[PDB]
Amino acid sequence: RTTRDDLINGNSASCADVIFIYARGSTETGNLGTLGPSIASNLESAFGKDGVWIQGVGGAYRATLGDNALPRGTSSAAIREMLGLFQQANTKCPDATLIAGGYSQGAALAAASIEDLDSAIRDKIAGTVLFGYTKNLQNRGRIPNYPADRTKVFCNTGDLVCTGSLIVAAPHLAYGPDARGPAPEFLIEKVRAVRGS
């Protein structure tokens, strides 16, 4: 449900084939918040419960609203926590395909972490989904250093954070349908593109 630590808890002798690392929005609970559980259930349907590990970004990422105003759209402590999880995935399961996502502050966190990542680990992330991306205008709909064909941004009309503001309006809270269908669809397609099946 809202906390999943499958990568931290998982046995290195029985690594999943796919590892999903997700950062929640501001003030959301657990480490998956409101959208992460919907994406997770559809990934487990596609790959099986033993086939995918779901890992939210917890620890030092407190998802504090005020940190949206900091230079990268989140805190340096939160970026170190998400980088640490990508590096743990790479060490624990070197053959797994990675996928990532984030909502709102979590989308800025996912973009900042991927930008800073060692390229050999960044290149293992087959697809990333971003909802209510707070750096959408500033980054021109891209994650720095990461290919456009592996990125999918869900930015609703009237969601002001997608257009350079930090005002929260009703369209910012309306990504439930996307998390239920097109966002897991995109991640599954990008994993199968490189792993076959």
Euclidean distance between CA atoms 146 and 151, whole angstroms: 8
Report the DSSP beta bridge partners of residue 56. Answer: 22
Euclidean distance between CA atoms 6 and 76, whole angstroms: 24
Catalytically active residues are 104, 159, 172
For residue 104, give every residue at least 6 positions away whose Cβ sits within 8 Å of its Cβ, in sequence order, or none: 25, 26, 68, 131, 132, 134, 161, 172
Q: Burial letters for 146-167: b for 16+ Cβ neighbours within 10 Å, e otherwise?
A: beeebbbbbbbeebbbbeeeee
In total, how many domains does the chain have? Answer: 1
Domain residues for the domain of 191 are 1-197
Residues 189/92, Cβ–Cβ less than 8 Å: no
CATH of residue 196's domain is 3.40.50.1820
Instruction: Give kind and range of the element (H or E) at residue 175.
Output: none
Instruction: Give kind and range of the element (H or E) at residue 144.
Output: none
**Technique used:** X-ray
Q: Tally the residues of the chain.
A: 197
Euclidean distance between CA atoms 140 and 142, whole angstroms: 6
Query: What is the experimental resolution, given in Å to one decimal place?
Result: 1.2
Sign of torsion over alpha carbons 18, 141, 186, 159:
positive
Euclidean distance between CA atoms 130 and 132, whole angstroms: 7
Report the DSSP beta bridge partners of residue 131. Answer: 103, 154
C-alpha closest to that of 99 among 155, 40, 48: 40
Sign of torsion over alpha carbons 139, 144, 147, 152:
negative
Residues 39/187, Cβ–Cβ less than 8 Å: yes
Going by the DSSP 8-state scheme, the letter that residue 64 receives in this structure is -
